[PDB]
Design a protein around this ligand. Sequence first.
Ligand SMILES: Cc1ncc(C[n+]2csc(CCOP(=O)(O)OP(=O)(O)O)c2C)c(N)n1
Ligand SMILES: Cc1ncc(C[n+]2csc(CCOP(=O)(O)OP(=O)(O)O)c2C)c(N)n1
Ligand SMILES: [Mg+2]
Ligand SMILES: [Mg+2]
Lengths: 788, 788
Amino acid sequence: DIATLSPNEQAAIDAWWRAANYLSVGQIYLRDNPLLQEPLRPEHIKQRLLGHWGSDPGLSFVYVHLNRLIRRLDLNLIYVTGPGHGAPALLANAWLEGTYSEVYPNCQQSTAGLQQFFKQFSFPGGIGSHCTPETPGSIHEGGELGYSLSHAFGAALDNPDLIVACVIGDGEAETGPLATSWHSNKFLNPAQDGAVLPILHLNGYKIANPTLLSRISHEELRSLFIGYGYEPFFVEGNDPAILHGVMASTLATCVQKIQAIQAAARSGESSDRPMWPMIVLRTPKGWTGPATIKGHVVEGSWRSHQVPMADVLTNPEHLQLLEDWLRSYRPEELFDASGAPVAELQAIAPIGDRRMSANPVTNGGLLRRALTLPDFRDQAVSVPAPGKSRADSTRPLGQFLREVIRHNPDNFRLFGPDETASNRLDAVYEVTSKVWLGDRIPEDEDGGHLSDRGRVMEILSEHTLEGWLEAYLLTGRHGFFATYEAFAHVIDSMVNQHAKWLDVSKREVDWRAPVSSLNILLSSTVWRQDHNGFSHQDPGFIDLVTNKSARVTRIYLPPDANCLLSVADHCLRSTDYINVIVADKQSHLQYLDAEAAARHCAKGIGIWDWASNDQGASPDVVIASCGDVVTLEALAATALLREHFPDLKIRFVNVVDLFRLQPDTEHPHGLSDRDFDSLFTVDKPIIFNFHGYPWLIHKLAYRRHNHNNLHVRGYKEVGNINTPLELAIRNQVDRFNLAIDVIDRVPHLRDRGAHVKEWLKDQIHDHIQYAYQEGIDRPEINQWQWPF
Amino acid sequence: DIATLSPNEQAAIDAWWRAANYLSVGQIYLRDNPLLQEPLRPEHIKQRLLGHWGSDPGLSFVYVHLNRLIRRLDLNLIYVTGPGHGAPALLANAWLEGTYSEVYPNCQQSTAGLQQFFKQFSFPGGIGSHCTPETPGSIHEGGELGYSLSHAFGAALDNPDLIVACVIGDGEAETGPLATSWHSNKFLNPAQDGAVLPILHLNGYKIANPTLLSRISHEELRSLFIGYGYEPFFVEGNDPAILHGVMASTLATCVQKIQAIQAAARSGESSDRPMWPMIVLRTPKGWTGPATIKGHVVEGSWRSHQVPMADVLTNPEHLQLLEDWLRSYRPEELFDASGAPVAELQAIAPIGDRRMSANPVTNGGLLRRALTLPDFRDQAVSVPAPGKSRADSTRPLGQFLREVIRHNPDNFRLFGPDETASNRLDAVYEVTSKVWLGDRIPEDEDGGHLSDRGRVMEILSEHTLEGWLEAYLLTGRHGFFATYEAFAHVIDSMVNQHAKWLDVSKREVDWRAPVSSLNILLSSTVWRQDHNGFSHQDPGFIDLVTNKSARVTRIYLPPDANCLLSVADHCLRSTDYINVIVADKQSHLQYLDAEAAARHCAKGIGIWDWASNDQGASPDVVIASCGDVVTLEALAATALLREHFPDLKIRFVNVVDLFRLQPDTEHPHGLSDRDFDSLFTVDKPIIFNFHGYPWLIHKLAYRRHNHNNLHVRGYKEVGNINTPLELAIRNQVDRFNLAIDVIDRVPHLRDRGAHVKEWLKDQIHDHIQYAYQEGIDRPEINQWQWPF
Ligand SMILES: Cc1ncc(C[n+]2csc(CCOP(=O)(O)OP(=O)(O)O)c2C)c(N)n1
Ligand SMILES: Cc1ncc(C[n+]2csc(CCOP(=O)(O)OP(=O)(O)O)c2C)c(N)n1
Ligand SMILES: [Mg+2]
Ligand SMILES: [Mg+2]
């Protein structure tokens, strides 16, 4: 009889819901006198009110009913919260369960604890107004709307017994990212993955406008969610006495369907995509607060958002209304004399680790197991001569990722936006295929690698693809994101949200265990100009992640395949960083051996001895490169200069870890002044080729002593369509432009390099003319290799 | 008998479709011998193949059938293209119509012209592989997928007789932005707006993966689009003989419904939201190219994306197959001896301006009419004393925008992501309300401002909101975007796409008339930290738009309301810029009179005489500010310094136009070296308060002579929750931190300013302690005003 509830246990559910609402109101308003033992006075109210109330009753209404199902059916849920500004509702229920008392002993379950509990919310030196990392049992910050549903599916990607209850605000459902995330049920395998129970909180209003989904007809709303692949169940009303029975019955039915779906799939008798149940709530906005305030409707309206009454200190009448509002929950029968919840409320709280706020899944770092990585030197290419052998850069990486999948069959996934094949990572398909969970045709088997049990996630929407990965990591698993650099601006907002989550969890919150790292691989960079991607690519994503501190983000630009393996191997072991790896899929030169590449990545930046002209003497110029396309151009320029000026001494420096340039004061990761002055001399000119905007190097190396002698070339603009070398000429990162820049900077070459500079300009013109006539570069340009 | 088509006219339609397909293949592959008069040889094939073929037959199939309806029903369409990489299909049909010959006389309709026509595509010194601005009759670039449907609705926002046929690739429909854009039919008013006929090109595959929408059941697909508010019609098959009849019948029926919908709405007898017709195409991908190539299925598969055969010069067998492919269209009966389309094809082309490629709507600058702007000096606040009066900053702007709406009732709209009321722009509601076109309840009137004829567009999603505006501008109308700075990262990718469109159209394309400017207003900046927005706001959007050159983007940071009006007035007259206006909604000080604000905006950066300490003497320090919150702190610091050091001489410089700092060499807009050295002295230290990342100032003013003496304070990081003054202290942009920095930099104060520096530090500590105890700043901090 799970569907029906006894009248007495409905009272306990109702009492819990009132208590949660009372604590929600207290946090927003009160600063002292939590239990209204003495009459409310203006010194008890917070001066600045920033909390949100409109969505709080709805979140608490769902939370109390989910707790009922946990006690009876012994489930485990995590309750990903969409609105995010309904943080008071989550904290209030966590406090009642006892989770908040355990995590924060200061906010004890007593009258003194309540005063501290109310005081801290939305207060300086206290918790924030959203679901920040300080919130127990929270994986989604919720401040930026649209990513709640994708996070729900990410947390359920490999937890077969987990059920994720994601509450979505209708205002959030208008956003782009969330509209696609509904389709993510077609990538969820019932046999080996958990279930997501999305609940659409259709209160009917945003801050100031009716929501789109509330104002479409009931038939259209039902048809919309059937099209998404769900089976919608509607819970509508405004009377708690009726809604308690309806909500309990509907939730019980939905969970039975979810268990029925999983049981059939795991038995192997029904391997077909099911209609996942879904719940729609039509509760009024703020449907327990004041009805009218200033002659306007406040309950179930857009005015219920955040604070119904902002002016309470000034207006004594409003303060009386606020006091009447608190009394409406009848706190005298909810808390005992000491200030703790009465025995009635304690009896219906989940016990121990079953509590949604205390679920270990939310604090995923506790469940994180280190990846069993194979030795990457077994996939490294062979380079008997550096700079003379040619091989495909991403083929070794695909093989390495294939091995990682084999040895980590449950806690590793590969995320790629329909470009894993385009990125030349087909080696991963030799063991596992892409997960589809949809209908299949015979032509798919020949062409594509599709199966229900697939460790590679593919969908064009990079918003939901990024959402899956972030939730996957915060749950304690590992993953690798491989995409194009042209489309990195799409996930720009999501990376910022994840970046601030890691930063806060690392420093401010001490009970948050370290989660795995967010590894992003960007291929097909701006310079090659592949067939895919728009004409005007942009390396601006590298700039936007540098705004985040070096304590949370790392950027790597490996020059060849072996260095890519070392970077990939190292970054699969890190914990609390956003690693951005900029590689290129085209067949390039190979410079570093397996052992040499490993040492190079350990230093992050080093001098290439085979390319450097003279050791044991002071260099005349330091030529540095960061990317891998620009690395070839820098080497080609070095070959030209050494051929035309035999006595010129050149030191070649290649930098892989971009944040090594920052001084040691900014971060312990950066190079010290002595170490930096050793690589880049204190007085000789530095010619720096860089994949990306040339100014990013100036920002990092601004505090250095020799910054005034640093000359950076890099991406400026791209024409409509160009050959690989013509594009380099336009941005002046070409081999000839690099050689010309060296001649200008070196003092003793200004008079002696006049003849060579003229010849170099002729080469620039000659190659451009050939490009226009033939559309391709000369054969000796594509087949260039280190001559010394 | 529009539905049925005569057998003879079906032959003409088929002949046109074959001709369009033949030209599509020629552009991708051929470089000479366009009509295959001589046998195909490897010297005729392009060396590098970058064109896309998979989507080309589908686009041409729709295009030829739309042209049939234009001739018969005298419609006018624009054919917004979603795939974008199907550029060859658009150019081929433009060539056949004659539009391409007229716009580009070099590519004449002859054998010589065809050779030039094929040669230029995807070739250096030629057109690109996407729908760049060079493409006749194109408003959407299509390179970044997901924005096609929003652009279709933007183009029809005020053209009552226009019908927009938007073709959407199924892979694009997976993206987040496009999933929301389906709901934009609920903001389109049938009475006064055009219609959008979205066509879903469901070929079943992307580059390497089956598409999500193709693999859901037919019933789910139908239910999904009924939920979006459309009435889906399915056109399925692979035999052109049958599809020609079915496609013609379906298109004719859909247009009759669209005309029936508009006629009923304009008659006033049915003011209800209708079910807009929509079409789903299930044609195979590349369903006229080769069937098998290397033992794999190539037609109607993911291998048909871009080029079916990449190795043609190397493999003689593939070249044979390519030659057989071209012959399959039978070019001998499509082009005459001279190389022009036969009289049969010419007879079915639309005449003159009815051609979709020649429609003036696509080249919106031709239809652009200047906005009738009222004198902004009638909405200006009064400031008898600068820096002493306090007034709301956005209230005058809302009144000004209300006047603009009244005098421009047809070609001006205001776009706001459900924050116009929160942004304190309710003055606009005094004349026109928000457009809803959905069901309404009585509570809606009493509170919100909703009506079918509304000039304010409000949807929570910012991808579709930005998409509407960009299409609105490119169609020749005007608009104003008002949003929060915290959510500017969402429209990050869309702005870059619009930025490159304006840049290419301004320089490369000469027949593109100048469209109106994209005016973006960012309110509720990071410093105030209002209730809305996540805790960790970011001013990074300002940095990203600076990566674009100053020739396409402008950034303004007005300090008060009157300067905000002048900036808004000026930027409503500009044409080809992306104007970013960073204001703040909170009640601030007012510094500039209506006349003074006008002069200040004309110069872009000037010396405030009332705040400057001593004229006629060399300043000891130049204090500069950019934003408006930091402007108050800079003024407060000046008041402290002038109070404690009477003999200190301070020059106060306020900069509104950010790009004025760039040297005149970078752009003619920037200040000359003499002008810059006049404002900021050549040798005295400069203390620069900046709203945003402090390094952006260094990037702009790097080439200046006095850059080494420039010290920028700005946004660094934000705590979980802070008061307005505590946040400034953390970032050291506070008045006390500013005063301390001045004491350090000024050489003759480092000894005399020891006592004052200690007192300033005490003030910092004292205010922080009060904030922690009370949660609010001291009254004398909020009520500060210029004392001199
Ligand atoms: C993309 C985006 N647009 C706007 C906002 C501003 N915002 C913060 S909370 C909120 C309300 C969202 O409404 P809904 O999801 O219905 O929430 P509820 O009514 O349950 O509070 C809005 C618009 C945002 N955070 N992100
Ligand atoms: C957001 C985004 N993801 C991925 C890409 C890369 N891309 C460009 S075209 C394409 C194929 C998808 O095209 P589809 O919509 O299926 O069109 P059709 O071939 O049916 O015309 C892809 C993945 C992109 N440009 N933008
Ligand atoms: Mg809501
Ligand atoms: Mg497709």
